[PDB]
């Protein structure tokens, strides 16, 4: 047992274990033992982490139903993000035609209404309130629903199931099938009314004579929903808790808002998007990675935080600066698996702070900052409550 047990981290708050920044600033490649599957390499530098996303000598296809190192015991499922060419660069090519940077910016108007909408009842109801449930937690579902085309009537019955996928199996997989068949149904309707919708234009999207089949269509559909619900809530709620930890940095925004774009990529990079590392990638060829030489069939996991705070790429890398002349962060990913939610995450977080920071200037923690509790759950860090007062 050269390799330390990965059960080493803790998601107490938005803290990261020091190993990541010792390994980066010394041992190119570090080795740790995952509780399930074997042991695995741990890339931590900007250099290596960038590579693990982009190097075709790193298959993620070759993880479908394999005994690979991991943190969960569930063995993952043919998804856009466990594919590789030519299947991935075909699926994603067809989808990106419907899920354009245009369509997602055109959502900004609606997204305004919805933030305004939420602080409105949130203000109306009286302080103290709790932003996770009260405003950040729904904003992104209401925005995902609008994107796909989920009609107003079915909207509150969508949240029914979409939140039944967290607490049993005879209700989550009920909620599974209940949402598969609901979406497959809804797509059928967009083929009838060939809309200016996203489900509308995924059908109508064709590369030469290629098209998405019922199970690629529904499969892609459902994947947005899971990608964009729980991680846009947590992008927001945390980013606030952080912004509120640096009042220095609020006033700079509050009494200036031309920086909302630049401050979001900033607030992303600085904040860990997960409590553990990533979904271990598999070397299909021998590739020297950050000094050490990953043998083919050997596994490696990317930590983004350490990449995003690499003193080799970021000057003053642990201070928050909204004036950074350039921000090549990894929080939203790199290469041909660039987050396709990207444009929407930016227009959501911008206008969500864009609003809150103005519409509630004197918005402050209700309870001592130390006393705010985080979920002892898993995957990415979540806020039990974000109790605020005004
Ligand atoms: C709001 C709607 C969102 C949608 C619809 C969405 C969808 C996706 C999809 C489909 C991918 C995989 C792309 C591919 O392999 O072809 C992706 C990647 C990614 N998304 Fe999102 N996303 C969203 C928001 C976010 C947010 C808020 C975060 C916050 C951290 C995030 C983090 C990531 C990361 C890190 C990747 C890297 C993919 C990889 O290399 O494995 N996404 N997103």
TrEMBL record:
Pfam families: p450. Keywords: Heme, Iron, Metal-binding, Monooxygenase, Oxidoreductase. The lineage of its organism: Bacteria, Bacillati, Actinomycetota, Actinomycetes, Kitasatosporales. Coiled coil: none annotated. One of its GO terms (molecular function) is heme binding. Signal peptide: none annotated. Belongs to the cytochrome P450 family. It comes from Streptomyces rapamycinicus (strain ATCC 29253 / DSM 41530 / NRRL 5491 / AYB-994) (Streptomyces hygroscopicus (strain ATCC 29253)). This is Cytochrome P450.
């Amino acid at each position: 047992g050269k390799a330390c047990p990965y059960p080493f981290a803790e998601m107490e708050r938005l803290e990261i274990h020091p190993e990541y920044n010792r390994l980066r600033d010394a041992g190119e490649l570090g080795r740790v033992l995952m509780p399930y599957g074997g042991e695995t390499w741990l890339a931590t530098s900007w250099e290596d982490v960038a590579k693990v996303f982009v190097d075709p000598r790193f298959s993620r296809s070759a993880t479908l139903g394999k005994d690979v190192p991991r943190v969960l015991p569930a063995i993952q499922q043919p998804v856009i993000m466990l594919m590789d060419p030519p299947e991935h660069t075909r699926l994603r090519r067809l989808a990106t035609k419907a899920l354009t940077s245009r369509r997602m910016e055109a959502l900004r108007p609606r997204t305004q209404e919805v933030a305004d909408d939420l602080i409105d009842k949130m203000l109306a109801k009286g302080a103290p309130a709790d932003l996770m449930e009260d405003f950040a937690l729904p904003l992104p579902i209401i925005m995902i629903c609008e994107l796909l085309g989920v009609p107003i009537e079915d909207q509150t019955k969508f949240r029914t199931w979409s939140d039944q996928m967290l607490y049993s199996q005879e209700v989550v997989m009920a909620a599974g099938q209940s949402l598969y068949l609901y979406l497959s149904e809804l797509i059928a309707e967009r083929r009838k009314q060939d809309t200016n919708d996203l489900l509308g234009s995924l059908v109508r999207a064709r590369d030469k004579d290629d098209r998405l089949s019922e199970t690629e269509l529904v499969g892609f559909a459902v994947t947005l929903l899971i990608a964009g619900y729980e991680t846009t809530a947590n992008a927001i709620g945390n980013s606030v808790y952080t912004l509120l930890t640096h009042p220095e940095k609020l006033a700079e925004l509050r009494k200036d808002l031309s920086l909302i774009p630049k401050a979001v990529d900033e607030l992303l990079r600085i904040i860990p998007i997960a409590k553990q590392a990533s979904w271990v990638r598999m070397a299909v060829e021998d590739v020297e990675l950050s000094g050490t030489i990953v043998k083919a069939g050997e596994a490696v996991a990317i930590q983004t935080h350490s990449a995003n705070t690499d003193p080799k790429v970021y000057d003053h890398p642990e201070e928050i600066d909204f004036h950074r002349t350039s921000n090549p962060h990894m929080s939203l990913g790199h290469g041909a698996h660039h987050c396709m939610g990207a444009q929407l995450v930016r227009v959501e977080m911008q206008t969500a702070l864009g609003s809150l920071i103005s519409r509630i200037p004197a918005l402050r923690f209700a309870v001592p900052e130390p006393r705010i509790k985080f979920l002892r759950g898993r995957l990415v860090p979540s806020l039990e409550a974000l109790p605020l007062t005004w």
